[PDB]
Design a protein around this ligand. Structure first.
Ligand SMILES: [Zn+2]
Lengths: 172, 150, 44, 47, 146, 114, 243, 750
DNA sequence: CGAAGGGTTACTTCGCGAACACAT
DNA sequence: TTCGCGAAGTAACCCTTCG
């Protein structure tokens, strides 16, 4: 009845889809949702992402300025470590051929905080003036060391569309 | 090793939870005889039947009596086995009662008993706990080292 | 109250307003709420 | 973990179920006795 | 026996799709056992009366029950007429599995012969779930010795 | 009881991917998640990237997804999520860059048939 | 009635399972004879009396509003009024919950809940670091949920009560509770024929002589029901080796 | 079934799987040893075998066990290790090394009685009708009573009315337990009471130290949507908005300053994100990276049922249901002690190198160990004192145990089969409460309903039935790999608040998926078991009180077989019954065609089992084979037990294994310390159809007597039968008591 | 009238028993 | 691995008086 086409392409993408645990679904039973705001950060292979968003229109944060001890907040942060599954994909439709591109490391995120978290370890210097390796604590050791790649986006629409449509154009 | 004769004080079973010590030992010119000359091996008291509710022994006697007269060993398994309906047809074919109760005489006076006696073959076991090993007595023997007790 | 904060995902709480503003204010999740507020719940 | 507390003295040999007041003064073993299996006999007198 | 069986079957029919008038007790599913246990206990007494009304003269289990040699009149009607209602711990047999006593009965079945009602004799022979229901109650009195 | 209500729930939520398939006739940046293990050759093995297709609809509302080798690899209808914001990125560096792809809508299973 | 009951009478313990209290009535009519006497002993809470425990809010730190159905008091006869529930919050529960003095606004606005400046900054001499933050959570949210629990009416040692029927013409209630000194104080029952279990509280309210007569009766009740004849000259001595 | 199973297989197959797999698996994790001084001289334990000597066929252990019975000598074949050390020229040299002795129980794979029939049993002087299954050390023969326990990797929700309601979960780390509980105080406050941590820790910080800190999904992860759990759990979040609101920089610092193990080593490791052991020792789920969302959600499901068992009537798991009880076999019990003795052999081998290594002249000539003979005496004196004495107590795996190995009772033929096939008594000693002592309806196909030792140990110990199969172990990687194929959705991509979609699914006490289209998952995955693929253990059952569906895979529980019914008929198929007794298509060729599968206890509550064929309805899922299989070996001796009443059948099971009889064929060539014989044995006239299977008609234990039920002579008033003089005079029931009074004579020191 | 001393009741921890006697 | 009451041990709080 309907001979929907269907091809697999994608080699150098390695696309990382997220999962924000902050905003709910059908706010007021109206399909008009998902705004998000500017630039983020990143950390190397333990991944522990550093996506963050700034503030918005007024909420009267003047009484409890700002984070914990009057530090001038302008951003809300969140972190998430990217342990990988297998089996799923990413895919979209040309009123015909879905594309089914691969789905490299994917996990969710948790709302990590700014100097609210750092106030207790800052107070320690403000007022008070076997095998030690792999197995129990190396994940909490090699995860706070250096910075890397991170950069803003550019809303790549035509280039990735071309890269998904050209490679799969041999079977038909 | 020693040979132990069954004497007064040894206990027996019935495969149906019926313990019992030997009452006495008694001769063969005693316990009563039927028309063919069978005197019993063991006489049980019927008073152990109602309060113990063990009617499976009371099917076992009539299923084992027809098993001899037919020749074939018959079955007594759970939830089946040999039915009682086609059991006592062997009894009336041989010439016996439907219920396995033939009239006995008396060995002590000769005249026949006033009631009908339910007699037939039932498999009995012999246990441990013989009275030769349970017998124990002491008059004045050794004492304890610490408390000077027997 | 069982009321939670939007867009920063923690638990709302009501504190003293220091006689300058008459509202609630929260730890690690600032928010503004007016003087009108109800809680409809039936305990059988 | 040597034994069942590994030490008995003067109260453990006096605590009940093996002691003196329980197992040597009140209840004690007595000579001139004997036990054998019972059997029925109606021909005795009742005394 | 099918009269009280149909009565207990119809009383559950009024219990699932509707509701019954309660007694001065806790609630329903508690006054259900008092009405299904107080009804099946009359069947055994009635059949024990009409069994000894019928039972033949010059037989030894009636003479031992007339005297009291070793036995009673509920005893002689239990191996002849019918056994009935193996009570454990005061109430009926509870569920060993989820919402049912044995997997040989459908789920959430509070009918008799499922929660425990031996509708046979010792002469007649027992069914296997009926044999299990008798074997449970033969343990809780046997364990009272030890 | 469970099989009848099961097939009625499958009928009630079986049009939804056919609803989404004719939805979005234009092509902006969108995505949806497919999942399928057990890579088939489907005509032979040329090298992971295997040729595959045929995820059509049979008559009277029957999504007949199948891998083309032998199997009617049929089955859809995954769980609807409650979280809303979800976004696809790309951190293949290429002199330290990153992207922002398509605000993916949903997820649906592709189950083998036994 | 079996071996734990005689173990408990011999042991003379201080706690007891199912201590029923038998207290004979005056009248035998249908309404206002055996209903009100049960109607002031049954230990009702406010959960079956009051509708909702809504917290209406003014600008900072308002009260806890509670909406009490008088129609339930019209159905089941209870002698509580707009003042009787007001007294029972303050003085009947004073060392448990704390509320000094307020009044009702009018037309069922019982509001006996207050948190005055956080107990004046929690006893104003600053016991804590900005004491208890003056949050509406530590004492006010606690009192939000600790008051479907206060007693509006009843006798504070009683689990439940129900009415049994006399053999010939009347009916007779029986009470599962403790203490016995305020059950016979209730009008409608008389303290001349009020008997119960738990000998140690009969000794507490009647004496040593009226307690041994409860020993030689409860043993006579727990064993003659099993068909045991024990010739009560034996048990009158056992009631006098601990009297 | 009994032709290849044989009613004694729980001791045989467990020991065979031990010497096949676990004897190699122990040295797979205990083969690395070195020394600080001279960091050369490494040992590498390569492939081990139990009495083979691979360049031969059979040697040394040619002796029978009957020679090892009259001589007071143990029955054993020596075990061999190849070692690949380096001494002078660092070349790995091969040499066969005998290290231990290791007694082998009779009729095993490494035994001489394997494949013997009618000629070899008579030449080696042993009866071919005994069950075997026993050890023989120091002359006497001893069994290992199979112990049962509770389920390890589960959640027990046993409650209490006076004290607040309890919820616990034991575990195991390869030989230990490390149990945990928590009691609840102050009108609902969930704690985490553990013996390795000081007093009390609230639930709100454990989920923030391990997992989610959002405090929005937490009022849906453990609360559901709306029903009654909101006000119950809302008192537990007041503790987080008063003391501790954020992650590891306060969450793990609240635990690390309170937890203590401290080892007498590794002290200054405190506390911020390092020493995260206390959040990984609170289960058996070992994690390496920051991937513990399944473990955190498993802690959250551990505290969801304690909330569910407050509004609901009882909603408890009892310690009486035999779906909550596994059992440890003989091989699983000897494996832990062999592992502990091999590790005691390992570190005592380290101490014997540097003691004689301190430069006599050199270190490069001899065979580099030379001190194993006293250590070979030490490794066999522990196995010969764990079986003979019975104390398997070692201070490593946190258990003292006595009264597990008993001497084999040899009174009749069925007393040797009552010592065999006998599950023991675990804890909950039950002085006054008859909770774990009374009989339960759950033990239908297994755990025989009549065979119970009447006395002071009644109810605690019991006995198995005929059609009973107990597994050992099953793998876990190609089942979690297969659930992803069948359509589950792993936690790393369905982490949303859409997690309680009315059912869920978890694997053996570890939460993996969350399924939609639920009965499509259960029926399709059960069809994989009935077709020739992964099978033999896999319990598949959905729940209605709880909502998940279980794919239980860790072995050690009961697996009775039943026959499948179709939609409107059965899978009996009478041509298969004709082809069964023809010679081909045995019971092994009977599961592969999809006719029977092994059902369970916790699985058959999702099954409607028919008894006979004459009462089938299209709602059934299975059918039972033979309804007399509940009565076991000892209980099967009773003729017509369904006519007797239940105390009569229990009193015979303590008496069939007590009567004198015709014990064995080698009855006169054995010097037992006490055995009773009988001169003229007779078969029973009423053969039960299960005493023909266990061969009771070969060696019977009594005589047929022409009884006459009548009141006679007055000497039979109360339970005392009278006998004939002239029948005992002709030999009715003659006995022969046979006793041993052995002595030894030995040489002295001088 | 505010603060200090004496004293009543209330919350939490330990230990002592668990039946007779035979053969091991 | 268990219920029973009776010993200490320790805290919240109310009455009484002092200058
Ligand atoms: Zn927040």
């Amino acid at each position: 009845i309907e001979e929907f086409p269907l091809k697999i392409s994608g080699e150098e993408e390695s696309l990382h889809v997220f999962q924000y645990a902050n905003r709910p679904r059908l706010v007021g039973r109206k399909p008009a949702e998902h705004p998000f705001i500017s630039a983020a950060r990143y950390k190397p292979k333990s991944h522990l992402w550093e996506i963050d968003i700034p503030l918005d229109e007024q909420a009267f944060y003047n009484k409890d300025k700002a984070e914990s001890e009057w530090n001038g907040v302008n951003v809300q942060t969140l972190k998430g470590v990217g342990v990988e599954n297998n089996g799923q994909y990413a895919a979209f439709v040309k009123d015909m051929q879905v594309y089914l591109v691969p789905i490299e490391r994917v996990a969710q995120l948790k709302p990590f905080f700014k100097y609210i978290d750092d106030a207790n370890v800052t107070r320690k210097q403000e007022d008070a003036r076997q095998n030690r390796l792999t197995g129990s604590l190396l994940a909490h050791k090699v995860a706070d060391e250096e910075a890397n790649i991170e950069l803003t986006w550019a809303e790549g629409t035509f280039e990735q569309f071309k890269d998904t449509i050209v490679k799969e154009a041999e079977d038909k | 090793r020693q040979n132990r004769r069954p004497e007064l004080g040894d206990k027996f079973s019935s495969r149906h939870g019926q313990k019992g010590v030997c009452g006495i030992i008694v001769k063969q010119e005693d316990m009563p005889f039927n028309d063919q000359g069978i005197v019993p091996d063991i006489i049980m008291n019927p008073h152990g039947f109602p309060s113990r509710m063990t009617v499976g022994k009371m099917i076992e006697l009539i299923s084992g009596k027809a098993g001899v007269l037919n020749g074939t060993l018959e079955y007594g398994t759970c939830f089946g086995g040999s039915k009682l309906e086609d059991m006592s047809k062997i009894l009336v074919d041989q010439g016996f009662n439907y219920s396995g109760k033939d009239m006995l005489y008396s060995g002590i006076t000769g005249e026949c008993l006033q009631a009908y006696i339910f007699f037939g073959p039932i498999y009995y076991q012999k246990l441990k706990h013989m009275v030769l090993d349970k017998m124990h007595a002491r008059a004045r023997g050794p004492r304890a080292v610490l408390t000077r007790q027997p | 109250m069982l009321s939670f904060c939007p867009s920063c995902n923690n638990m709302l709480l009501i504190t003293s307003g220091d006689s300058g503003v008459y509202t609630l204010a929260c730890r690690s999740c600032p928010y503004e709420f007016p003087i009108e507020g109800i809680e409809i719940y039936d305990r059988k | 973990g040597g034994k069942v507390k590994p030490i008995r003295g003067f109260c453990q040999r006096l605590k009940g179920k093996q002691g003196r007041f329980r197992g040597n003064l009140s209840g004690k073993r007595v000579d001139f006795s004997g036990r054998t299996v019972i059997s029925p006999d109606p021909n005795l007198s009742i005394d | 026996v099918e009269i009280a069986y149909h009565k207990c079957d119809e009383l559950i029919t009024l219990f699932n799709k509707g509701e019954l008038e309660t007694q001065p007790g806790c609630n329903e599913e508690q006054t259900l056992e008092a009405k299904i246990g107080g009804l099946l206990s009359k069947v055994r007494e009635e059949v024990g009366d009409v069994c000894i009304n019928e039972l033949d003269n010059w037989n030894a289990p009636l003479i031992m029950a007339t005297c009291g040699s070793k036995g009673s009149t509920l005893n002689v009607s239990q191996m002849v007429a019918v056994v009935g209602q193996q009570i454990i711990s005061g109430n009926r047999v509870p569920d060993g599995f989820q919402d049912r006593s044995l997997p040989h009965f459908p789920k959430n079945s509070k009918t008799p012969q499922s929660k425990g009602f031996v509708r046979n004799s010792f002469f007649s022979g027992l069914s296997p779930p009926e044999f299990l229901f008798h074997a449970i109650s033969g343990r809780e009195g046997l364990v009272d010795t030890a | 009881k469970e099989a009848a209500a099961e097939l009625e729930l499958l009928n009630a939520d079986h049009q939804h991917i056919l609803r989404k398939l004719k939805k979005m006739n234009n092509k902006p940046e969108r995505f949806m998640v497919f999942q399928l293990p057990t890579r088939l050759p489907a005509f032979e093995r040329p090298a992971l990237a295997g040729k595959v297709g045929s995820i059509r609809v049979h008559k009277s509302g029957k999504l007949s997804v199948k891998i083309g080798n032998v199997v009617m690899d049929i089955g859809k209808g995954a769980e609807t999520t409650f979280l809303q914001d979800v976004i696809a990125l790309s951190i293949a560096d290429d002199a330290s860059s990153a992207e922002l792809l398509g605000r993916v809508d949903g997820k649906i299973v592709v189950t083998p048939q036994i | 009635l079996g071996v734990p009951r005689i173990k408990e009478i011999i042991n003379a313990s201080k706690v007891i399972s199912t201590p029923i209290i038998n207290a004979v009535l005056v009248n035998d009519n249908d309404e206002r004879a055996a209903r009100v006497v049960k109607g002031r002993v049954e230990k009702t809470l406010l959960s079956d009396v009051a509708f909702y425990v809504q917290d209406v809010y003014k600008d900072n730190l308002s009260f806890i509003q509670v909406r009490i159905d008088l129609g339930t008091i019209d159905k089941l006869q209870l002698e509580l009024t707009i003042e009787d529930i007001a007294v029972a919050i303050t003085r009947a529960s004073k060392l448990k919950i704390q509320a000094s003095d307020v009044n009702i606004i009018g037309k069922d606005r019982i509001a006996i809940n207050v948190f005055p400046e956080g107990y004046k900054a929690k006893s104003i001499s600053t016991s804590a670091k900005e004491p208890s933050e003056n949050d509406v959570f530590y004492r006010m949210q606690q009192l939000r949920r600790a008051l479907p629990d206060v007693v509006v009416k009843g006798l504070p040692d009683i689990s439940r009560a129900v009415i049994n029927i006399r053999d010939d013409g009347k009916r007779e209630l029986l009470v599962e509770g403790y203490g016995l000194r305020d059950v016979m104080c209730t009008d409608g029952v008389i303290g001349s024929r009020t008997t119960t279990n738990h000998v140690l509280e009969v000794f507490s309210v009647l004496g040593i002589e009226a307690a041994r007569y409860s020993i030689i009766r409860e043993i006579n009740y727990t064993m003659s029901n099993h068909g045991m004849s024990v010739d009560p000259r034996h048990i009158q001595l056992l009631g006098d080796v601990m009297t | 079934f009994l032709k290849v199973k044989g009613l004694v297989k729980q001791h045989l197959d467990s020991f065979n799987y031990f010497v096949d797999t676990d004897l190699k698996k122990i040295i797979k994790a205990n083969q690395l040893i070195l020394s600080d001084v001279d960091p050369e001289f490494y040992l590498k334990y390569v492939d081990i075998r139990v009495g083979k000597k691979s360049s031969s066929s059979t040697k040394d252990y040619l002796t029978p066990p009957h020679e090892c019975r009259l001589r007071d000598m143990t029955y054993s074949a020596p075990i061999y290790v190849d070692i690949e050390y380096t001494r002078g020229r660092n070349i790995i040299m091969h040499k066969d090394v005998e290290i231990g002795r290791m007694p082998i129980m009779l009729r095993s794979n490494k035994c001489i009685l394997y494949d013997a029939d009618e000629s070899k049993m008579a030449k080696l002087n042993e009866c071919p009708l005994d069950p075997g299954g026993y050890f023989i050390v120091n002359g006497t023969e001893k069994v290992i009573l199979v112990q049962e326990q509770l389920s390890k990797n589960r959640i027990i929700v046993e409650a209490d009315e006076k004290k607040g309601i309890v919820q616990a979960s034991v575990t195991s780390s390869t030989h230990e337990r490390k149990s945990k509980t928590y009691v609840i105080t102050k009108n609902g406050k969930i704690y985490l009471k553990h013996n390795s941590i000081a007093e009390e820790i609230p639930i709100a910080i454990v989920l923030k130290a391990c997992g989610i800190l959002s405090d929005l999904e937490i009022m849906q992860l453990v609360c559901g949507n709306d029903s009654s759990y909101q006000d119950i759990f809302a008192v537990n979040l007041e503790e987080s908005s008063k003391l501790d609101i954020y992650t590891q920089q306060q969450a793990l610092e609240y635990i690390g300053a309170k937890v203590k193990t401290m080892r007498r080593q590794k002290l200054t490791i405190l506390q911020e994100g390092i020493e995260a052991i206390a959040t990984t020792v609170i289960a058996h789920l070992t994690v390496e990276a920051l991937d513990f969302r399944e473990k955190a959600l498993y802690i959250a499901m551990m505290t969801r049922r304690v909330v569910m068992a407050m509004y609901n009537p009882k909603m408890i798991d009892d310690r009486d249901y035999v779906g909550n009880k596994r059992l440890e076999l003989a091989g699983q019990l000897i494996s832990l002690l062999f592992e502990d003795l091999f590790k005691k052999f390992n570190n005592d081998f380290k101490l014997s190198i540097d003691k004689v290594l301190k430069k006599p002249n050199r270190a490069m000539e001899y065979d580099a160990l030379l001190s194993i003979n006293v250590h070979s005496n030490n490794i066999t004196s522990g196995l010969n004192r764990a079986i003979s004495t019975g104390n398997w107590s070692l201070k490593r795996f946190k258990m003292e145990r006595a009264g597990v190995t008993h001497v084999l009772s040899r009174l009749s033929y069925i007393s040797a089969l009552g010592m065999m096939t006998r599950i023991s008594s675990q804890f909950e000693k039950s002085r006054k409460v008859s909770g774990p002592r009374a009989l339960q309806p759950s033990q239908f196909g297994m755990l025989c309903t009549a065979d119970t030792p009447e006395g002071e140990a009644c109810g605690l110990v019991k006995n198995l039935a005929l059609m009973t199969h107990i597994t050992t172990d099953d793998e876990e990687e190609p089942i979690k790999k297969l659930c992803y194929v069948l359509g589950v959705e792993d936690i790393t991509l369905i982490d949303s608040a859409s997690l309680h979609l009315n059912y869920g699914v978890y694997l053996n006490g570890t939460l993996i998926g969350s399924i939609r289209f639920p009965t499509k998952f259960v029926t399709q995955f059960r069809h994989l078991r009935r077709t020739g693929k992964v099978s033999e253990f896999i319990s598949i059952y959905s729940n209605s009180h709880q909502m998940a569906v279980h794919i239980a895979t860790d072995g050690g529980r009961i697996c009775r077989p039943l026959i499948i019914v179709s939609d409107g008929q059965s899978r009996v198929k009478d041509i298969h019954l004709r082809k069964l007794l023809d010679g081909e298509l045995d019971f092994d060729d009977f599961l592969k065609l999809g006719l029977v599968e092994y059902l369970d206890v916790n699985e058959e509550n999702d099954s409607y089992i028919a008894l006979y064929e004459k009462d089938i309805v299209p709602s059934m899922t299975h059918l039972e084979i033979e309804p007399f299989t509940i009565l076991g070996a000892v209980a099967g001796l009773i003729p017509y037990p369904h006519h007797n009443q239940s105390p009569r059948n229990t009193y015979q099971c303590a008496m069939g294994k007590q009567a004198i009889g015709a014990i064995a064929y080698n009855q006169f060539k054995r010097i037992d310390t006490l055995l009773y014989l009988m001169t003229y044995p007779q078969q029973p006239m009423v053969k039960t159809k299960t005493i023909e299977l266990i061969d009771y008609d070969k060696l019977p234990a009594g005589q047929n007597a022409t009884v006459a039920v009548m009141s006679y002579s007055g000497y039979d008033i109360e339970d005392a039968l009278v006998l004939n003089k002239s029948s005992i005079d002709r030999g009715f029931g003659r006995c022969e008591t046979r006793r041993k009074t052995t002595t030894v004579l030995k040489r002295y020191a001088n």
